[PDB]
A = this chain, B = another copy of it.
Amino acid sequence: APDSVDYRKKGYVTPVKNQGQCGSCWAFSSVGALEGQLKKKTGKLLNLSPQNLVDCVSENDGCGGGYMTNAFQYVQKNRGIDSEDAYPYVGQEESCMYNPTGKAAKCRGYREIPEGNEKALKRAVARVGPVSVAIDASLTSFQFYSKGVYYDESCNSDNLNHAVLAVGYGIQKGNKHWIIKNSWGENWGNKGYILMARNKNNACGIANLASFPKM
């Protein structure tokens, strides 16, 4: 495993999205991991549709929230997920409108990172690609993050409430970090990204509910 990796440089990460008021971060996180695998398997980078997941993953609760594994299982059972161009984001739960003609990716299952294992999360980001992760995003400090390696001990690894995407990891000024892609728009944080402290005892519970799609 390399000491640092960044999938944005390789072209495995789509532009930062804005979920709006909807509790759909889990759909943006799932799509980001699927997008990375799709690029890995076909050489194509394209936007996949979070709305498709919000409207059709009955295991989840639409804008009320959800888990990424349920999203990967749906794409697997459904035999596909639409591209964003074929099923645009609207920011509110609506009836399933999945369209097989707009199918842009498939999923053969999923793999979960063992709970709290930052070492395993790091190997996955390195050898598989971007990995869906859950963190505690409740603090005002995370919300007003702007630069540097974010860390707060008030972060509660037992209070997971937000889904994001680990697109890489590394070190900045001797400080280990995860490169995290958020879905709060290009203006939140650092152009929509946040560097989160790595190996500081699973800060913000970053390795507590991580998983990635199989393709």
Contact = CB atoms under 8 A, between A and B. Distances in A.
Interface string A54-69: 0000110000000101
Contact of A69 (B59, B109, B112): B59
Nearest to A69: B59
A157 to B, nearest CB: 14
Contact of A73 (B58, B73, B112): B73
A67 B112 CA distance: 18
A79 interface: no
Nearest to A115: B58
B58 A112 contact: yes
A77 interface: yes
Contacts of A109: 77
Nearest to A113: B58
Interface of A: 58-59, 67, 69-70, 73, 77, 109, 112, 115
7 contacts: A58-B112, A58-B115, A59-B67, A59-B69, A59-B70, A73-B73, A77-B109
